[PDB]
């Protein structure tokens, strides 16, 4: 089926400290050419509520560009009817302190349709990814 999703950690190195600017932790690309109503990311496990979890026991908040956070529902969502693959990124807010360790994210992605118009889930995939933060000496 034409539904597809790519959840990948960012290739570039991340450095421990107060992040100098917005830094992408993960890249998320999902799409379908044939009809649907929208898309959502439901964080799972210890990612509950939009969080990366460190091997030091720290949660760090993830933010989105394309989608919008609904905490009442614990999901990022975006409503769009179009074939164009959605280019979205999970990132950390500037000034966010990162520690030189391994940050994990688990979730599941869902696709839907509106009739009428309340969410019916057409597809799901379980995304996950990790990013290991380097150090500045
Ligand atoms: O486009 C409808 C959306 O409404 C939001 O409130 C909800 O959190 C999403 O899961 C989705 O149902
Ligand atoms: C934005 N969030 C509520 C999903 C995560 C929390 O972010 P922050 O409290 O780490 O800034
Ligand atoms: Cl957000």
For the chain, domains (ranges, CATH) are 1-137 (2.60.40.3590)
Ligand index nearest the alpha carbon of residue 41: 1
Q: Report the residue among 63, 74, 103 best suited for mutation to probe ligand 2: largest number of ligand atoms under 8 A from its CB.
A: 63
Is the Cα torsion angle 133, 125, 87, 121 positive or negative in sign?
negative
Tokens of 66: 């394309």
- For the Cβ of 70 lying below 6 angstroms from any atom of ligand 1, the answer is yes
Residue 75 near ligand 1, beta carbon < 6 Å: yes
CA of 12 to the centre of ligand 3 (A): 22
Q: Cα separation of 63 and 24, whole Å?
A: 9
**Segment 16-19 long-range contacts (CB within 8 Å, at least 24 positions apart):** 16/98, 16/99, 16/100, 16/101, 16/133, 16/134, 16/135, 16/136, 17/97, 17/98, 17/136, 18/95, 18/96, 18/97, 19/92, 19/93, 19/94, 19/95, 19/96, 19/97, 19/98
In three state form, how does the secondary structure of the chain look? CCCEEEEEECCCCCECEECCCCEEEEEEEEECCCCCCEEEEEECHHHCCCEEEECCCCEEECEECCCEEECCCCEEEECCCCCCCEEEEEEECCCCEECCCEEEEEEEEEEEEECCCCEEEEEEECCEEEEECECCC
- What resolution (Å)? 2.5
**What is the CA(116)–ligand 2 centre distance, in A?**
32
Ligand 1 pocket, residue 121 CB under 6 Å: no
Method: X-ray
């Amino acid at each position: 089926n034409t539904f597809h999703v790519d959840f990948a950690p960012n290739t570039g190195e991340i450095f421990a400290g107060k992040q100098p600017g917005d830094v992408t932790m993960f890249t998320l690309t999902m799409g379908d050419t044939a009809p649907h109503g929208g898309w959502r990311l439901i964080p799972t496990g210890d990612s509950k509520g939009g969080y990366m979890i460190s091997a030091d026991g720290d949660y760090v908040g993830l933010y989105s560009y394309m989608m919008s956070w609904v905490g009442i529902d614990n999901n990022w969502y975006i409503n769009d009817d179009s074939p164009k693959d959605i280019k979205d990124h999970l990132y950390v807010k500037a000034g966010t302190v990162l520690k030189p360790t391994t940050y994990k994210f688990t979730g599941r992605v869902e696709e839907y349709v509106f009739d009428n118009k309340q969410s019916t889930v057409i597809n799901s995939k379980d995304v996950s990814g990790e990013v290991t933060v380097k150090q500045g000496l």
